[PDB]
Design a protein around this ligand. Sequence first.
Ligand SMILES: CCCCCCCCCCCCCCCCCC(=O)OC[C@H](COP(=O)(O)OCCN)OC(=O)CCCCCCCCCCCCCCCCC
Ligand SMILES: COC1=C(OC)C(=O)C(CC=C(C)C)=C(C)C1=O
Ligand code: SF4
Ligand code: SF4
Lengths: 92, 314, 159, 157, 174, 80, 258, 67, 28, 96
Amino acid sequence: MNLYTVIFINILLSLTLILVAFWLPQRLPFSMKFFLVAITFLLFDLEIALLLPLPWAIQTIKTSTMMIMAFILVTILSLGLAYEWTQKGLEW
Amino acid sequence: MFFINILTLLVPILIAMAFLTLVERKILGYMQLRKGPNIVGPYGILQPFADAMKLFMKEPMRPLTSMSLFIIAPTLSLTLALSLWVPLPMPHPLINLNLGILFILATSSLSVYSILWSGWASNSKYSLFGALRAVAQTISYEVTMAIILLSVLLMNGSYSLQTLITTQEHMWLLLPAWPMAMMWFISTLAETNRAPFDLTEGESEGFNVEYAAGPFALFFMAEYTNIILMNALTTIIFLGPLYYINLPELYSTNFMMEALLLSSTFLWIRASYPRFRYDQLMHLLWKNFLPLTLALCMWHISLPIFTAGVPPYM
Amino acid sequence: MNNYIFVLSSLFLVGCLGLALKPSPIYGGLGLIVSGFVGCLMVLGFGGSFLGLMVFLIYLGGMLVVFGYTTAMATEEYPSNWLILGFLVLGVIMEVFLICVLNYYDGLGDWLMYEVDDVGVMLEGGIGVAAMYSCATWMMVVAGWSLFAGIFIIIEITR
Amino acid sequence: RSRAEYVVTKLDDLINWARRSSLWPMTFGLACCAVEMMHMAAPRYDMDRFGVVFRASPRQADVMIVAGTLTNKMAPALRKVYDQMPEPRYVVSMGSCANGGGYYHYSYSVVRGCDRIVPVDIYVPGCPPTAEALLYGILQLQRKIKREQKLKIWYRR
Amino acid sequence: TYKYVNKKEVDMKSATDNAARILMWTELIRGLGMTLSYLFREPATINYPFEKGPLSPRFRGEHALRRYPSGEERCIACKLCEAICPAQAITIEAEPRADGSRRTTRYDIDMTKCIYCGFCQEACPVDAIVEGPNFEFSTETHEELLYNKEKLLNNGDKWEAEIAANIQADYLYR
Amino acid sequence: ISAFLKNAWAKEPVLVVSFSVWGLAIIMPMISPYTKYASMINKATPYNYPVPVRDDGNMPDVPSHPQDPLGPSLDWLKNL
Amino acid sequence: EMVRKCDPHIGLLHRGTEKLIEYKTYLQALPYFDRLDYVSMMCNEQAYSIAVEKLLNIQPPPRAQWIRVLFGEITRILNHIMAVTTHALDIGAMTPFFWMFEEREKMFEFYERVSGARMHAAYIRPGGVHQDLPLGLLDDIYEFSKNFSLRIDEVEEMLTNNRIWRNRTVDIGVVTAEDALNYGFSGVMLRGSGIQWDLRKTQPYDVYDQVEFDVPIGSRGDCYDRYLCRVEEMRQSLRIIEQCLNKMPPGEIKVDDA
Amino acid sequence: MWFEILPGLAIMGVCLVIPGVSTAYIHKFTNGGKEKRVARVQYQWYLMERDRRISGVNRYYVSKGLE
Amino acid sequence: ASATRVIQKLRNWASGQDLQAKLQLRYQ
Amino acid sequence: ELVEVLKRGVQQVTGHGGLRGLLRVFFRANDIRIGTLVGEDKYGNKYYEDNKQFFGRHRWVIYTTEMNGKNTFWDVDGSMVPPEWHRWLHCMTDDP
Ligand SMILES: CCCCCCCCCCCCCCCCCC(=O)OC[C@H](COP(=O)(O)OCCN)OC(=O)CCCCCCCCCCCCCCCCC
Ligand SMILES: COC1=C(OC)C(=O)C(CC=C(C)C)=C(C)C1=O
Ligand code: SF4
Ligand code: SF4
């Protein structure tokens, strides 16, 4: 709610401006690299999503497993990146 | 009251947003041996209001194009940028959100659409080519932008921006984690499409190509407000302004000083550097920065544990 | 406020109906981005916090954006979208039709949060999602294998 | 005061002040008179000081300065770009090569003036019209706008 | 005599030096210093209406027709100002004035045609047509730019004092 | 091999640093005088109420005032 | 984003300069040459001058020759300040243009106080210069020259080694030496590829023979290398200007053949 | 000189401190003279609402030993 | 000019050479 | 040093007559500086030259209201300066 109040004022302020604007003055998909980049982006995004709980997981009693897990995730994705840098990938 | 607290935190920022363009058209000027705009008003103070009125009055030509993915795009750009100032923790924030930084990261991410929607809406080749490249570096930079924050959080203990005021009561997070500050600063330069990383809408006229008058203004306003917001996030996350619980405004006074200087810095960066190539730009993030960030990300999961410094939740 | 959820739920169905009439590839992307916004809110409406913003952070701008991204590159071509919009409205009132009958014979807020555990300082989500590293560390490994597999799998599909 | 006519005039003036203070030009840069404009943009005679932006695309441009010969091949383009600008738009012809035909008036490939292809509001004379002279010409466009009284004619129409 | 603009060991000291240059962007910081430096220099711009960029006596500026101190217009219609004009701008037709003297019935400089070469200033034997100092004669309508004898003679009378000073300063050179 | 590291430190001076950190983070935890504390310091932090057991008898559990000298202590956390 | 083929179109500025000249006398065609490439206003005139002087077998007086080399070089600087700074504006660096356009401005003033026009002077005529230098110009073409160097130096500290200028310029548009001669490049473009040819040293015109300058040859010809060459000729032209001020002879500035 | 870029900045700064001082005094005036309590975890809300239920109808009102 | 002896030193330090010797303001 | 810089700024503000007088100079020119008055022409105009300022700005003219009854106080025009004083302003001749 408190947030709602702010947000609707935010949209109102912008819709007010566009309206004033209008009312006052009375195909080649060559870059599959583009697509490639974008595939990577989510693979990295999804990975981020897996890393996002790490602040709560720091306080986990295990600790050893936490780090062992987190280090494995970061390392395996980075290797994914590495292989993006071995073939003709990430070289647009 | 709460409404009054919405005027403040909005208007004040909008008025300041207007004065940034002026301090951009003068600081770039003297750096280039020229006075800049001083003739309209006293010392150019009325200059930002003047073109705002000229922009809104000029015809918002609707190209022979979508009519919604065209008007949604500037509304979204201004709405997200002004919205992201809602949770910012100057002294104490307006709407304190327990997962605050995820709000800022998510809201920023949504702005990439406005670029995509405006580019598709224009229906001219310059717009589509510009949008596709623009969307590419924005999300490319988002990936390191997010990881750099995750490293920070793990040393802050929580996603709430309010916690960092208690984390940085003895030292700025620049001393530690400076290597990422730089990488946060460069990423903040990319995400606001400012100069070193401003290939879209360059001298090559991307998603303003068909945008004139009122639509031009709204994104326009958005960009500059962002220019401030991202600089302000640098001034909370890495440069922690001194906080005294007895007097909350010296926090905001120093927040004012650091934000203005780092906002001045991207103005200074623009005049000083030529623009990078499209692939040069992605070459930096995926080759130069992402391996640095992912590794320094692991160092920030290790620094806590073996230095027995796991941060206190809450 | 009561039944805040049902309204939203109704909006989620509207967005899904929009994706179902298969509107133009990117006009509907918006549709998803709309119901993803809506679902983000609902999860955030049942007290969910991290899960709620995750979708907004990942499905919203990560996947969906990449989706349209590709739409522009391919399948950006064009030829009745307004007719789709027209029929969309048709079923909107029709949802009410269904709603009317349900209400006709069986009240939200009676219960949206089932037990509040009011005295608790370790009660949110994200403590559960962080079981990937304690007591549920097999979901984490298999997700990791899928991502690692994805990088290798996709490069051939492009090549 | 409240008699509307006064109220209208004041309002118009504001409108005129906004357009006249911030004129964003676009420089087709045909020929050389472009070099004499880049000089205006440059430090001795700062155009920005007056509110004129150094560069602008056609969509966001208030005034088009045609510098240089408008040759017959470029004549269809000039028009296009003039036709692609906003509803409040203006044209400042710069150079004898574009005011009339200039040294190349009798040529077969040069349009004898841009005012045969785009309506022109201020004609700035001189083969390389001096940068100060352009600045004088841009300032006279500012006095031309100041005098325009669009809403009072609406009111009296 | 020639010179090689860009014609060209690995030591930790060297490498560490080079790596620091890439890692902490040392040269980029160098560039920022230069612009900060000028920010502190005095700007070179002039208030255009209040202060004017300096033009010395030979500045060609705007055409004017002079008159003898007595008041008789200098031009005697020899019409070689028309002959040497590169753009065909000057059109002159003449007839003997009743006095019996030779004067131009019509003298029309088309300023839009004129490219301000200054040869007419050169060619005139009586030096009747001169390149006057004024450069600010921008006009709302195209017709105003076309100038007949009366505008040029009027232009001559208005600026005669400065034209005389300018010709006074530069005639020894010519 | 020295070259494999001296030019790779002159040119490409990012991946070197990148990997180096990857490793240093993979080592410090293994060898450190504090690593053990993390699992303790976080273990100790009391979040959920400590439910008391019935005193059948013969127990070392702190009876009555928790201040009793028996039981666990965090003096390790103190003066840490 | 990859260019497969570039077919430049030209003639958007064809104006008839070659046909118009046939209908005009030699002296009334001199102003056309200033307009042919007006960044380099005078140097172009010198070419017509020389050509008309050869046909007449007349040669200009000694002072006029030095003048033409004096303003010939000043003009080279003016062109290079245009080429280097306008190059950067398209690249995206905008402050070098404003820095050096102020220096340009100061040079224009030389033109004006010598010819009367800021650009499009018509000063170098087929038989020498039109009018002797004003009494005092040489001194100012000194003060300026004495300082301009630092101004070139500054641009440098901003672009020669920018970590980013190099990237967008280095290894872009490399042209082989044999190919450059074959496509008739004949300019810095040849010199940048390492071919040593300066028509000013190989076939001296005017008194460019009596001066001493170093052609800035380049290797690994690419956008960055040639640039460096243009910054170096800005430097070498200051060396030629200095001399001309130090050694310009007393005399007449136009042939004595009425 | 450069003296003049300051006017503009002044109006930016002044417009970036307002918000931080404003939000931090419209809290200390709409929460009875005391910072607005931050309910981050269920327990902080409980005590926050328990307090409401304690007296009057607002939390800032804090009953003391004399009750 | 009118460096005041402190803006000049920031100018000299930032530039790395003496602009005082080769100023942008031409004088008599 | 800077205190003398501040005294110079105070004298410039006090130099243009009263608070209202400098406000008038402030609005039409946007530049405040004090110089010796070389001359006042018959068309209302006032001319000042300062040796200390750089070549571009050492000679300036403050235009006057209604020099031919035109309400010229706000719409300042370059052509308003008389032909005699035009060359002094453009530095064509050193002599006033
Ligand atoms: C026990 C210790 C554990 C930790 C160990 C840490 C080891 C030391 C730190 C190592 C990393 C230090 C540097 C990290 C940031 C820089 C990363 C980097 O390499 O930059 C990328 C790029 C490289 O340049 P390039 O030549 O293109 O690449 C060569 C290799 N391919 O560089 C660039 O292109 C930069 C382009 C920048 C454009 C804008 C420049 C702005 C400059 C002014 C702002 C500087 C930042 C200000 C920050 C203020 C506070 C936030
Ligand atoms: C000389 O060629 C030209 C350019 O490229 C070099 C320009 O960029 C421009 C644009 C410059 C300005 C003043 C906006 C012009 C005018 C031009 O003609
Ligand atoms: S007018 Fe003189 S300068 Fe302008 S274009 Fe024609 S020739 Fe070149
Ligand atoms: S030359 Fe001088 S005198 Fe002879 S006609 Fe032309 S103007 Fe009159």
